[PDB]
Amino acid sequence: ENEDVNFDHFEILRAIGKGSFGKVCIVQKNDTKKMYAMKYMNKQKCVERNEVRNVFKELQIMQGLEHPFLVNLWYSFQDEEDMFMVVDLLLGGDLRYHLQQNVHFKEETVKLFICELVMALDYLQNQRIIHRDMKPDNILLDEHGHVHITDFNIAAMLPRETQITTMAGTKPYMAPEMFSSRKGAGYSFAVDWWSLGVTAYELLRGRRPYHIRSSTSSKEIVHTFETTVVTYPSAWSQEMVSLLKKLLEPNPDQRFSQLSDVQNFPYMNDINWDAVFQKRLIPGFIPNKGRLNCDPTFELEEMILESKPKEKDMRKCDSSQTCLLQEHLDSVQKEFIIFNREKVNRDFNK
């Protein structure tokens, strides 16, 4: 069938995360009974806050990506109030949650995390994509402990022989080259390998390798990178330490920034990369409690679980503010491009 998937094809279950433009929810598709994560984006808020172009860019990027260590897009659609993104549901939740439970991850587990994510990053680069927000909050586990990159909210397409200067990222994960105010400058894919490093170090240690905050001035940060020596606890293997160090090269040109740099790294001579890609190397034991749990809380929100939830056809328009809104909403409705991977899959076998 060539029928369009829309919001009525799903049943909405528990909310699992929050956004300035709407929630993330668990949904079940009615027909297949398959469960997904769905990101709401309020059209009005998006228009008022000039996010519409970013939402479209993200959808466009996600439509052209598929990889075992990404949280992949399956459907997009809209109704009158919202735009929707339906993507893989990762039942283990994010890594931040476990760090917040004071979990320290075993060296071997982190090695295997790096292997999986490095295949994702390399794939992103081959597709000309910088993610720009790699960090524990944005890396999700499946039920077997494999790790996956999500939240492409600030991901950018970088055309060949171009560079990017705009400051966008989470500051304690952002690479030194992102802060340099030298007029002849820029950054590239290598920044995602830096933040992978910061992320791996953080998983091993419990804390980040640099003290940087979201409030810290750019000048202090440049100073922090230039005058701090990262502490590498003696308990760690020289192999891991020397991996972390190639990810945390302040000079992007000397940093690992490619799948092959890691494939050829001695520490990694025991890795079967076909097995990694096929999800046959389980990283390791993962604590029972992840961010999805239904351990009872006093959250006023969602203790009301038992409850269940000819005016636009006039073409109304009142003031300049309300008329501009309508023009933009009209434009959203008309420009939005439905994506459906099932259909792309079916029409590949034809």
UniProtKB/Swiss-Prot annotation:
Its EC number is 2.7.11.1. It is a lipid-anchor. It is an enzyme of class 2 (transferase). ATP binds at residues 16-24, 39. Residues 10-268 form the Protein kinase domain. GO terms for molecular function: ATP binding; metal ion binding; protein serine kinase activity; protein serine/threonine kinase activity. It is found in: Cell membrane. PROSITE patterns: PROTEIN_KINASE_ATP (PS00107), PROTEIN_KINASE_DOM (PS50011), PROTEIN_KINASE_ST (PS00108). The active site is at residue 133. GO terms for biological process: intracellular signal transduction. Its cofactor is Mg(2+). Belongs to the protein kinase superfamily. Ser/Thr protein kinase family. This is Serine/threonine-protein kinase 32A.
